[PDB]
Design an enzyme around this catalytic site. Structure first.
Site, PDB file in Angstrom:
ATOM      1  N   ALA A 251      54.775  35.781  46.246  1.00 28.02           N
ATOM      2  CA  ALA A 251      55.285  36.450  47.437  1.00 28.02           C
ATOM      3  C   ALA A 251      55.306  37.963  47.255  1.00 28.02           C
ATOM      4  O   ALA A 251      55.740  38.476  46.219  1.00 28.02           O
ATOM      5  CB  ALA A 251      56.689  35.947  47.769  1.00 28.02           C
ATOM      6  N   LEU A 253      56.337  41.767  47.367  1.00 28.36           N
ATOM      7  CA  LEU A 253      57.531  42.593  47.383  1.00 28.36           C
ATOM      8  C   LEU A 253      57.498  43.492  48.618  1.00 28.36           C
ATOM      9  O   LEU A 253      56.478  43.576  49.307  1.00 28.36           O
ATOM     10  CB  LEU A 253      57.615  43.410  46.093  1.00 28.36           C
ATOM     11  CG  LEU A 253      57.758  42.625  44.789  1.00 28.36           C
ATOM     12  CD1 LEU A 253      57.807  43.568  43.596  1.00 28.36           C
ATOM     13  CD2 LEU A 253      58.998  41.749  44.829  1.00 28.36           C
ATOM     14  N   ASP A 319      51.048  40.790  26.680  1.00 33.01           N
ATOM     15  CA  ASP A 319      50.370  41.783  27.504  1.00 33.01           C
ATOM     16  C   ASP A 319      51.309  42.457  28.499  1.00 33.01           C
ATOM     17  O   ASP A 319      50.886  42.846  29.589  1.00 33.01           O
ATOM     18  CB  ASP A 319      49.186  41.152  28.235  1.00 33.01           C
ATOM     19  CG  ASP A 319      48.044  40.813  27.302  1.00 33.01           C
ATOM     20  OD1 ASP A 319      47.310  41.743  26.906  1.00 33.01           O
ATOM     21  OD2 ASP A 319      47.877  39.621  26.965  1.00 33.01           O
ATOM     22  N   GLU A 324      58.195  47.321  35.745  1.00 34.23           N
ATOM     23  CA  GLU A 324      58.397  48.040  36.991  1.00 34.23           C
ATOM     24  C   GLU A 324      59.859  47.976  37.404  1.00 34.23           C
ATOM     25  O   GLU A 324      60.576  47.029  37.071  1.00 34.23           O
ATOM     26  CB  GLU A 324      57.511  47.481  38.111  1.00 34.23           C
ATOM     27  CG  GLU A 324      56.024  47.680  37.871  1.00 34.23           C
ATOM     28  CD  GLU A 324      55.188  47.361  39.095  1.00 34.23           C
ATOM     29  OE1 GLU A 324      55.635  47.674  40.219  1.00 34.23           O
ATOM     30  OE2 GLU A 324      54.082  46.804  38.933  1.00 34.23           O
ATOM     31  N   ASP A 339      53.297  39.923  37.385  1.00 35.21           N
ATOM     32  CA  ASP A 339      51.985  39.641  36.795  1.00 35.21           C
ATOM     33  C   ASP A 339      52.114  38.988  35.414  1.00 35.21           C
ATOM     34  O   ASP A 339      51.826  39.581  34.375  1.00 35.21           O
ATOM     35  CB  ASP A 339      51.148  40.922  36.720  1.00 35.21           C
ATOM     36  CG  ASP A 339      50.808  41.481  38.092  1.00 35.21           C
ATOM     37  OD1 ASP A 339      50.382  40.702  38.971  1.00 35.21           O
ATOM     38  OD2 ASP A 339      50.970  42.703  38.289  1.00 35.21           O
TER      39      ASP A 339
HETATM   40  N1  LIG Z   1      54.538  39.542  44.118  1.00 36.28           N
HETATM   41  C1  LIG Z   1      53.592  40.404  43.680  1.00 36.28           C
HETATM   42  N2  LIG Z   1      52.788  40.084  42.641  1.00 36.28           N
HETATM   43  C2  LIG Z   1      51.843  40.927  42.192  1.00 36.28           C
HETATM   44  N3  LIG Z   1      51.617  42.141  42.726  1.00 36.28           N
HETATM   45  C3  LIG Z   1      52.350  42.594  43.771  1.00 36.28           C
HETATM   46  C4  LIG Z   1      53.404  41.728  44.322  1.00 36.28           C
HETATM   47  N4  LIG Z   1      53.969  42.406  45.338  1.00 36.28           N
HETATM   48  C5  LIG Z   1      53.331  43.603  45.431  1.00 36.28           C
HETATM   49  N5  LIG Z   1      52.366  43.714  44.498  1.00 36.28           N
HETATM   50  C6  LIG Z   1      51.470  44.880  44.307  1.00 36.28           C
HETATM   51  O1  LIG Z   1      51.779  45.860  45.301  1.00 36.28           O
HETATM   52  C7  LIG Z   1      50.663  46.077  46.166  1.00 36.28           C
HETATM   53  C8  LIG Z   1      51.143  46.144  47.607  1.00 36.28           C
HETATM   54  O2  LIG Z   1      51.765  47.410  47.792  1.00 36.28           O
HETATM   55  P1  LIG Z   1      51.954  48.008  49.270  1.00 36.28           P
HETATM   56  O3  LIG Z   1      53.162  48.914  49.289  1.00 36.28           O
HETATM   57  O4  LIG Z   1      50.606  48.514  49.724  1.00 36.28           O
HETATM   58  O5  LIG Z   1      52.333  46.709  50.136  1.00 36.28           O
HETATM   59  P2  LIG Z   1      51.790  46.581  51.644  1.00 36.28           P
HETATM   60  O6  LIG Z   1      52.767  45.748  52.439  1.00 36.28           O
HETATM   61  O7  LIG Z   1      50.334  46.185  51.573  1.00 36.28           O
HETATM   62  O8  LIG Z   1      51.881  48.103  52.160  1.00 36.28           O
HETATM   63  P3  LIG Z   1      51.794  48.462  53.726  1.00 36.28           P
HETATM   64  O9  LIG Z   1      53.220  48.332  54.204  1.00 36.28           O
HETATM   65  O10 LIG Z   1      51.246  49.869  53.749  1.00 36.28           O
HETATM   66  O11 LIG Z   1      50.858  47.424  54.297  1.00 36.28           O
HETATM   67  C9  LIG Z   1      49.691  44.933  45.935  1.00 36.28           C
HETATM   68  O12 LIG Z   1      48.335  45.388  45.990  1.00 36.28           O
HETATM   69  C10 LIG Z   1      50.041  44.428  44.553  1.00 36.28           C
HETATM   70  O13 LIG Z   1      49.180  45.030  43.580  1.00 36.28           O
END
Ligand SMILES: Nc1ncnc2c1ncn2[C@@H]1O[C@H](COP(=O)(O)OP(=O)(O)OP(=O)(O)O)[C@@H](O)[C@H]1O
Ligand SMILES: Nc1ncnc2c1ncn2[C@@H]1O[C@H](COP(=O)(O)OP(=O)(O)OP(=O)(O)O)[C@@H](O)[C@H]1O
Ligand SMILES: *[C@@H]1O[C@H](CO)[C@@H](O[C@@H]2O[C@H](CO)[C@@H](O)[C@H](O)[C@H]2NC(C)=O)[C@H](O)[C@H]1NC(C)=O
Ligand SMILES: *[C@@H]1O[C@H](CO)[C@@H](O[C@@H]2O[C@H](CO)[C@@H](O)[C@H](O)[C@H]2NC(C)=O)[C@H](O)[C@H]1NC(C)=O
Ligand SMILES: *[C@@H]1O[C@H](CO)[C@@H](O)[C@H](O)[C@H]1NC(C)=O
Ligand SMILES: *[C@@H]1O[C@H](CO)[C@@H](O)[C@H](O)[C@H]1NC(C)=O
Lengths: 435, 431
Positions: A251, A253, A319, A324, A339
């Site tokens: 899901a 974030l 790894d 974060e 991840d």
């Molecule tokens: N649950 C998760 N597992 C792995 N990676 C995540 C997860 N949640 C977020 N990410 C990382 O954060 C990035 C999404 O960040 P971003 O702030 O662009 O969300 P978004 O909703 O796409 O933004 P926007 O509101 O501009 O559409 C993903 O490309 C991923 O790499």
């Protein structure tokens, strides 16, 4: 009866957490500010969807519903973790990611950059899962889809066998279930799903590049590939059989616009051969120095890293180069364990160097230690509650028996390490209490 | 006299290498095909330059005698450059003195603009590096000196900061030449006028906008996304001059494709007590049976790379690169050595694991190491002497130079351990 039910009914898993939540300043998102941001995104998505339909040749619009699982998930993120203990919102979110149909699909933003201009330096990096996609569900929620690793190393001549993420999708699922059982609540909810790559990916994406990389295998299977990884002779294709493909869904974030995150290097990512003959995991001088280095001078941050090391040791994840954090929760905020695809790769080896923060600093949260001690008892055996919890997932069994039993063996090593610290410093010094 | 001069006059450093080059199939580039490709690029650059200057001089012509052109045409199956090469000497001087005509971001960093995500920013990554183009159309990778203290970079962990970053690239090339590996690109130090030689020559409007004047009246440029992620984000002249490292560009990937391969010994493992990881051979016994490490040359090349990395204390060789044309058994390119020469008082013997586990070494490599351990050709003495040629002399302080002698002795003592267990016939491989 049920050991998983007994665990969450145990008094330990019903102690209120201190300090109690003060509502506004302790929640990640402001409800009204975050909801109007999502409403603008839904209107944006509807505009693109109406215009895209006109450019081709051809339903009622989408509405941002406050009661959606992912919306409540985001609004539930607070100073105490990503989600709440025994949360029905998480249960609903797991089911929704498992069953809801998809409406859009695209590449992750970090991989849209690597569509070049092909350079194998930025492609053969570790911990990177190429061919992963971000899916959007009918309730507007988004998940990171990591497909199962299918190609053997003969098809990927550059990949080194013992570094291949064969357990990649199983690792994301099992890492969340262990996170919930440990009551860390620090990794995003994750489920397995058997996905029709034709209906739920190819036929819903608006990205022409993703459309063009789909093809039919000579064995009449539907596949999509990544061109730049193919030229670099690494993993480059996954296929349905002939349409269905198994993978993990995590899901999303909240947007970085609503909740910015920082990445911090893990000071214990590497071990060092000290000048003989003191062992690295037992020598405290390194942590004695880290204790004097911001932001590890305050108690909570070092204890959180020790929690992360315990988690990584249990799943055998070597790894975790970075962790974060949410900006809003400051230095004392909890660490996000994202991840976890590199976990659960070796059931027959225990890398105690991951536990180095615990064995060097010799301190641990009282809450963390009590949960580990409880999960070591037969009535709440960690392998039993994990196996039981993982039966809920569509890809059951997620973990085979050797991986489950290794959780018990590594748990005993953690507790036996705590005993060693207590012998050298006493319970008062090792077992730290929470404010 | 001069120990560095005695080294390259020694019989060992004048033995012809076997097998001798057979001309065509042993060179990296085809001369006529590569030259017409470069001529099209020069015509392209003159076209871009003619329109850009009109929106606000005689054109550039591709000269065959340019240092970098002969450098590219000199790359062959035996290494990036030749032993005692006057072309390399001229290239080092040219990168040090030639004026610049263009400047831009590195291609891998144009992607991270951005769209700021701290995951892809805090990765061994030098985000403030730039690619400079000289008046002879040659290109170099400019890595500026790390200037910001860790108080200005709250996310950076002190013992991971590449403080020696630019000195390490320079010294890694000089050690590569002295060892006669000839596997890292030529690299020089240079004190660069960031105003005259970067800001006023770049056509990238984004790079123009990130330059600013410090409150201390210094000229600086910054990276926006690293600043928000609270890592290293700015370097400054004083008020204009900034020292850094310049590494000569390899030929275009269009002309010479390269592969990245993971280093199977990047990580060590805690074996069940009490057998040590670097001494236990079971791991290499398995790697020896895994393609492409089943053939002799590839494993010996990795052992060479481990010896090099151990000498400079580089724990960050996650991957090595190779030229596609030379196939397997080809030599390994030792790129981006910025993580070396960081700890002069610590020796990470786990880097040497390929040598101590596999217990085999090139005859040529061992003879060069044995010679560099003698007083008349002492590795620290020839390195200190070699580094005096650089504009940022001494490049390496005395503790780093002396650590080279100590680590060389550890390598030789490891070889002795291998010979005791298996004999010279098994350990020392001939070519
Ligand atoms: N649950 C998760 N597992 C792995 N990676 C995540 C997860 N949640 C977020 N990410 C990382 O954060 C990035 C999404 O960040 P971003 O702030 O662009 O969300 P978004 O909703 O796409 O933004 P926007 O509101 O501009 O559409 C993903 O490309 C991923 O790499
Ligand atoms: N001496 C060096 N040290 C470190 N990295 C290098 C060196 N030379 C080249 N590289 C890397 O190899 C890449 C080569 O890029 P590229 O193939 O675009 O070269 P180019 O000559 O610019 O190609 P083009 O013909 O498209 O202009 C660079 O982006 C750089 O990161
Ligand atoms: C998975 O999705 C595909 C695509 O929607 C389904 O395939 C189709 O439905 C029937 C069955 O073959 C055919 O009449 C259609 O022409 C197919 N469409 C396409 C685009 O091929 C498939 O049935 C779904 N389920 C499985 C198990 O594959
Ligand atoms: C670095 O380069 C800058 C720009 O070319 C030099 O600054 C200039 O000095 C001349 C006189 O010598 C003035 O006419 C210009 O107005 C100056 N420009 C700026 C932007 O200040 C500077 O002297 C050089 N520094 C060196 C070579 O050390
Ligand atoms: C930790 O150290 C920092 C140093 O900048 C200081 O500001 C902070 O108050 C300290 N906090 C604790 C709990 O020691
Ligand atoms: C190593 O194995 C590959 C494929 O298994 C084979 O082509 C090669 O010939 C082998 N090496 C040698 C030296 O035979």
């Amino acid at each position: 009866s049920s050991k998983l039910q007994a665990l969450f009914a145990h008094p330990l898993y019903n102690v209120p957490e201190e300090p109690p939540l003060l509502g506004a300043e302790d929640s990640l998102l402001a409800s009204q500010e975050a909801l109007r941001y999502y409403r603008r995104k839904v209107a944006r998505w509807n505009r693109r969807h109406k215009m895209y339909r006109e450019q081709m040749n051809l339903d009622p619009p989408l509405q941002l519903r406050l009661e959606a699982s992912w919306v409540q998930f985001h609004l539930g993120i607070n100073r105490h973790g990503l989600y709440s203990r025994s949360s029905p919102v998480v249960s609903k979110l797991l089911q929704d990611m498992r069953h809801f149909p998809t409406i859009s699909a695209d590449y992750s933003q970090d991989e849209k950059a690597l569509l070049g201009a092909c350079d194998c330096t930025q492609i053969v990096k570790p911990s990177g899962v190429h061919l992963k996609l971000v899916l959007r569900f009918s309730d507007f929620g988004k998940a990171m889809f990591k497909p199962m690793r299918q190609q053997r190393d003969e098809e990927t001549p550059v990949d080194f066998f013992y570094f291949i993420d064969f357990q990649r999708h199983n690792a994301e699922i099992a890492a969340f279930h262990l996170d919930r059982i440990l009551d860390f609540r620090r990794v995003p909810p994750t489920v397995g799903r058997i996905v029709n790559v034709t209906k739920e990916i190819l036929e819903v994406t608006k990205n022409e590049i993703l459309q063009s990389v789909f093809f039919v295998s000579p064995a009449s299977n539907v596949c999509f590939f990544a061109k730049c990884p193919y030229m670099c002779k690494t993993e480059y294709a996954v296929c349905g059989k002939p349409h269905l493909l198994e993978g993990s869904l995590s899901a999303f974030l909240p947007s970085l616009n609503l909740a910015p995150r920082l990445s911090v290097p893990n000071p214990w990512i590497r071990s060092y051969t000290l000048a003989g003959k003191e062992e690295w995991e037992v020598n405290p001088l390194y942590c004695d120095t880290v204790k004097q280095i911001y932001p590890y001078n305050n108690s909570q941050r070092l204890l959180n890293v020790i929690d992360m090391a315990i988690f990584d040791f249990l799943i055998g994840n070597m790894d975790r180069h970075h962790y974060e954090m949410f900006t809003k929760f400051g230095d004392d905020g909890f660490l996000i364990h994202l991840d976890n695809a590199r976990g659960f790769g070796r059931h027959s080896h225990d890398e105690i160097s991951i536990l180095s923060p615990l064995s060097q600093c010799c301190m641990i949260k009282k809450k963390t230690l009590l949960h580990l001690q409880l999960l070591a008892q037969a009535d709440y055996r960690l392998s039993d509650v994990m196996r039981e919890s993982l039966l809920e997932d569509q890809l059951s069994p997620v973990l085979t028996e050797p991986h489950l039993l290794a959780l018990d063996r590594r748990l005993q090593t953690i507790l036996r390490t705590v005993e060693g610290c207590i012998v050298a410093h006493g319970q008062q010094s090792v077992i730290v209490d929470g404010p």
